Amino acid sequence: YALGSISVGNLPEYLPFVLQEITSQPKRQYLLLHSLKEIISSASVVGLKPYVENIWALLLKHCECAEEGTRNVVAECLGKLTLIDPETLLPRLKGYLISGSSYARSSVVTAVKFTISDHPQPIDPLLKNCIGDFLKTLEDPDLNVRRVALVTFNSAAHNKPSLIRDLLDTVLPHLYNETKVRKELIREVEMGPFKHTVDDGLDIRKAAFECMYTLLDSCLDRLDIFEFLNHVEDGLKDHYDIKMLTFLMLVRLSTLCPSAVLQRLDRLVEPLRATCTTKVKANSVKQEFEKQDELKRSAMRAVAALLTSPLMSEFQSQISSNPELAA
Amino acid sequence: DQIWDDLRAGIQQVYTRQSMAKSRYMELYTHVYNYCTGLELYKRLKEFLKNYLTNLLKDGEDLMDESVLKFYTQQWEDY
């Protein structure tokens, strides 16, 4: 931080030194890059005008790196630098999306993610016009590209939802498709009675669910309800984290459009009842017992919130002692 | 101690992410049953585990935040 702050003082004497030092040593650039992050956020733009092409070239050259942290650092640096002279950089960024590689596309989409800010900015119309093709025609080909696009969409919705206000319907089909589970991306290794399943696509599903939840702020008046709750109904039977997220979604939906929820309560709760009627696997560690216990408590809380008669009276000898712990 | 070499590499096989058939699991169980039917084995296993953790730490000492959380997560899951 001290080096980055000092570099602002005499840009002509400090900026080139760090620029060449970054390429000189490979085991230290990871720190030096961070210092550069301060310059663009601390140096005068008018004084920074001359030293832009060199920084852009260095960032593009270092964009494709094996280290993930270095990739993140260069992406953040590019995003911060994109703030200045947008009229000169935005067309170039648009061009890179026509023939760029997967890593380059991921880096460029991550760079523009940080450009969004809660307060008004002069890049409002420019970003609004540019984000169209970024969000629409960049979720088909790749998996990492899909994940980064979903993350950027969620970040935009959380901070500034006006940009995705006129194109929400244009992207709804892709978001809905991304929620479906794929059994080609689920690997399993078995070496005895125990079993463990590893999923390479669970990250995208979590991002899609988070985006759907955050979309409830000021967009329910536009998106339809019937086409929206079908995917949630399908996703009730999903991973534990997604299960809790969906339960919390249902709890929040109790006070919003209760008529739609009541019109399908039966099928909403049927998977929930099936899950609650589950039993812990015999000869299992206490971790699984606790995990299933929290899942059951969350399910009970969800049904209690929704209630505020499809065989709702199912209080057996043991379960009867659970509700007093929830309320 | 006589068959200390036997099953030795096996201790690593569970740690390495490689598919192993149930026949090998049965064979290892049979060897363990035969050996059991002797506290030095416990100490040897503890020392081997400590050495493995030390070796893992040796590599996991040059990573900063936002780049070591995932590595720690996968290592904990594997362990």
* A224 Cα distance to chain centroid: 22
Cβ contacts of B55 within 8 Å, gap of 6 or more: none
A316: its two tokens: 């057996």
* A165 Cα distance to chain centroid: 18
What values do phi and psi take at A293, rounded to 5? -65, -45
- Each as own residue / partner, the long-range contacts of residues A100-103 (CB below 8 Å, 24 or more positions apart, any chain) are A101/A64, A102/A142, A102/A144, A102/A145, A103/A63, A103/A64, A103/A71
Per DSSP bridges, beta strands A186-189 and A196-199 are antiparallel
Tell me the CA end-to-end span of chain B in Å, nearest whole number. Answer: 26
In DSSP notation, A198-258 reads EESSHHHHHHHHHHHHHTTSS-TTTS-SHHHHHHHHHHTSS-HHHHHHHHHHHHHHTSS-H
A277, A270 Cβ separation under 8 angstroms: no
b/e code A284-314 from CB counts within 10 Å (16+ = b): eeeeeeeebeebbebbbbbbebbeeeeeeee
SS3 A187: strand
Residues 190-209 on A with a CB inside 8 Å of B are 190-192
Cβ contacts of A119 within 8 Å, gap of 6 or more: none
Place of tokens 């663009």: A40
Q: How far apart are CA A293 and CA A307, in angstroms?
A: 21
When scoring B12, B15, B16, B22 by the number of chain A Cβ atoms within 10 A, the one with the most, hence best to mutate, is: B22
Nearest to A222 by CA among A173, A169, A177, A295: A169
**Is some CB atom of chain A closer than 8 A to the CB atom of B58?**
no
Q: Is B19 left (phi over 0), alpha (psi -120 to 50) or beta?
A: beta
Q: How many CA atoms lie within 13 A of A100 on its CB side?
A: 21
Rounded to whole angstroms, the maximal C-alpha distance in chain A is 79
Q: Rounded to the nearest 10 degrees, how much is the dihedral formed by the CA atoms of A293, A311, A253, A304?
A: -50
Place of tokens 């900063």: B64
Contact A72 B66 (CB under 8 A): yes
Contact A69 B67 (CB under 8 A): yes
A88: its two tokens: 């000169």
Q: How far apart are CA A142 and CA A161, in angstroms?
A: 25
Q: How far apart are CA A36 and CA A77, in angstroms?
A: 8
Q: How far apart are CA A233 and CA A246, in angstroms?
A: 9
Q: How far is B22 from chain A (nearest CA, A)?
A: 6
Q: How many CA atoms lie within 13 A of A193 on its CB side?
A: 6
Q: At what angle do helices A286-307 and A240-253 cross, to 10 degrees?
A: 20
A39, A6 Cβ separation under 8 angstroms: no
Residues 61-80 on A with a CB inside 8 Å of B are 67-69, 72
This structure was determined by cryo-EM
Contact A69 B19 (CB under 8 A): no
Nearest to A14 by CA among A23, A27, A5: A5
Burial class from Cβ neighbours inside 10 Å (0-12, 13-18, 19+) for residue B18 reads exposed
Q: How far is A191 from chain B (nearest CA, A)?
A: 5
Nearest CA in chain A to B68: A69
A243, A295 Cβ separation under 8 angstroms: yes
**Is the dihedral angle over the CA atoms A30, A35, A38, A40 positive or is it negative?**
negative
With breaks defined as C to next N over 2.5 Å, after which residues does chain A break? 308
Q: Which residues lie across from A6 on neighbouring strands?
A: none
H or E element that contains B13:
helix B8-15
Contact A68 B17 (CB under 8 A): no
What values do phi and psi take at A237, rounded to 5? -90, 85
Nearest to A113 by CA among A132, A101, A127: A127
Q: How far is A84 from chain B (nearest CA, A)?
A: 27
Distance set, CA A24 to CA A6, A55, A212 (Å): 20, 15, 45
Nearest to A79 by CA among A56, A102, A96: A56
SS3 A171: helix
What single-letter DSSP state applies at residue A320?
G
SS3 A130: helix
Q: How many CA atoms lie within 13 A of A172 on its CB side?
A: 16
Cβ contacts of A302 within 8 Å, gap of 6 or more: A247, A248, A250, A251, A272
Cβ contacts of A229 within 8 Å, gap of 6 or more: A260, A261, A264, A268
Q: How far is B19 from chain A (nearest CA, A)?
A: 6
Q: Is B64 left (phi over 0), alpha (psi -120 to 50) or beta?
A: beta
A131: its two tokens: 């984000």
Distance set, CA A76 to CA A41, A86, B14 (Å): 11, 16, 40
What single-letter DSSP state applies at residue B1?
-
Residue A252's CB is within 10 A of a number of other CB atoms, namely 12
A118, A158 Cβ separation under 8 angstroms: no
CB nearest to B67's CB, from A68, A190, A192: A68
SS3 A188: strand
Contact B67 A191 (CB under 8 A): no
Which amino acid is located at A199 in the chain? D
Rounded to whole angstroms, the maximal C-alpha distance in chain B is 49
Resolution for the entry shown, Å: 3.2
When scoring B11, B15, B19 by the number of chain A Cβ atoms within 10 A, the one with the most, hence best to mutate, is: B19
Q: How many CA atoms lie within 13 A of A234 on its CB side?
A: 14
